[PDB]
Write a protein that binds this ligand. Structure first.
Ligand SMILES: CC(C)=CCC[C@](C)(O)[C@H]1CC[C@]2(C)[C@@H]1[C@H](O)C[C@@H]1[C@@]3(C)CC[C@H](O[C@@H]4O[C@H](CO)[C@@H](O)[C@H](O)[C@H]4O)C(C)(C)[C@@H]3CC[C@]12C
Length: 397
């Protein structure tokens, strides 16, 4: 009934843990605890009445080496609370270790895709064998943090007790979920997806547009596109003849005359854009994204098709995944054709306004409704399986 969540020391991993807290606290009255430094706790000081937030402290020298030393603080926190279960992230390293010290079961929480992880663990469990689904990875042609990254992944997959929580749903990759289950010898439990004055202009502009006609573009923080990269997608949006809303992020670089040339038909935003509010709006019918996992989950929760412009890390593997189930399409690449006007305009026209992408549109809605039809019960089964894991540990000798 009482769970304690230790997310990693990164903002990209605090929001999933916080929304999981909100979702598990509103059902079965789960006495929730969430521990992380106050710097990462205070971002979620808004509508969090159901969960209980816990502080975590470290001391300086003379989060890098602090992470590697704040272990005892988490151990003291666990001894003070004595919770029935611990949910850890990717790189706490010692959190499973301490959970095994206080006789507390530790359940791993994967905030990434089953498909992506499946390639990696297949690689560990089957070094010689090839991927069971060659439509996703062809280990054939080319197989040329080092190993410290691999070991952390296989450890956080192995150290999980019985089950492994995942921020995913069956309707997107149940086959890869079952593959991961068979690979890790653990049961993969999907928890489904998970959910200032300047924002009224975006909504006011978006309300005046027709249904499923606006294309949202945002590529996330970090790896800030060069002006040469910006100009390609800018001209692709200009020649797409479709309404778009583009958000782009320390020297300031910008295309010359582009904002003037397009006049309206498009709104440029500097910082935080209403991603969820734009995707959920009925006027939106396209999302040009860098294929971040949380971004893909948000795009799929509202039935908005995906325009894949991945670049690094798991974003390609995520991207093509959206192209496998038929809810998205990728842009053609040259030597580095991720910045080309013709491919971007072609895919945008085909997905949003053309009939050839209707198969992508319908399947985007037919799946979205699915996510709202079987909703809430995924987390119910997750909670009851967590209760089963807690009650099976109740073993004296
Ligand atoms: C060829 C090799 C070596 C292995 C074969 C497997 C493979 C086909 O190739 C691909 C397929 C599976 C793969 C994508 C792998 C990559 O290798 C390594 C990634 C990685 C560990 C990298 C760090 C990432 O973690 C991010 O790290 C960023 C840095 O800060 C943050 O910005 C993000 O917030 C944070 O999520 C996260 C945990 C999401 C992923 C998890 C999945 C994994 C293993």
């Amino acid at each position: 009934i009482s769970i304690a969540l230790l997310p990693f020391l990164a903002h990209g991993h605090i929001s999933p843990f916080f929304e999981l807290a909100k979702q598990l606290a509103k059902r079965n009255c789960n006495v929730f605890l969430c521990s992380t430094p106050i710097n990462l706790s205070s971002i979620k000081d808004k509508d969090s009445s159901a969960s209980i937030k816990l502080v975590e402290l470290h001391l300086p020298s003379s989060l890098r080496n602090a992470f590697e030393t704040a272990g005892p603080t988490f151990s003291e926190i666990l001894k003070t609370l004595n919770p029935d279960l611990l949910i850890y992230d990717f790189n706490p390293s010692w959190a499973p270790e301490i959970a095994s010290s206080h006789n507390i079961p530790a359940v791993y929480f994967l905030t990434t895709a089953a498909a992506s992880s499946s390639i990696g663990l297949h690689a560990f469990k089957n070094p010689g064998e090839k991927y069971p689904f060659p439509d996703f990875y062809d280990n054939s042609n080319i197989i040329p943090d080092n190993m410290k990254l691999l070991h952390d992944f296989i450890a956080c997959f192995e150290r999980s007790c019985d089950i492994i929580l995942i921020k995913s749903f069956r309707e997107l990759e149940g086959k890869y979920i079952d593959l991961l289950s068979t690979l890790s010898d653990k049961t993969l439990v999907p928890v489904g997806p998970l959910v200032d004055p300047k924002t009224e202009q975006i909504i006011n502009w978006l309300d005046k547009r027709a249904e499923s006609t606006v294309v949202f573009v945002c590529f996330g923080s970090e790896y800030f596109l060069s002006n040469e990269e910006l100009e390609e997608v800018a001209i692709g949006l200009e020649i797409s003849t479709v309404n778009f809303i583009w958000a782009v992020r320390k020297k300031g670089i910008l295309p010359e005359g582009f904002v003037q040339r397009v006049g309206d038909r498009g709104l440029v935003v500097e910082g935080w854009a209403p991603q969820a509010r734009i995707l959920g709006h009925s006027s939106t019918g396209g999302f040009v994204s860098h294929c971040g996992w949380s971004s893909i989950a948000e795009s799929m929760k509202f039935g908005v098709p995906v325009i894949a412009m991945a670049r690094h890390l798991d974003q390609p593997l995520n991207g093509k995944l959206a192209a496998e189930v038929g809810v998205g399409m990728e842009v053609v690449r040259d030597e580095n054709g991720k910045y080309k006007r013709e491919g971007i305009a072609e895919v945008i026209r085909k997905v949003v306004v053309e009939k050839s992408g209707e198969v992508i549109r319908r399947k985007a809605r037919e799946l979205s409704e699915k996510m709202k039809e079987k909703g809430e019960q995924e987390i119910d089964r997750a909670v009851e399986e967590l209760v089963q894991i807690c009650k099976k540990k109740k073993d004296e000798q």
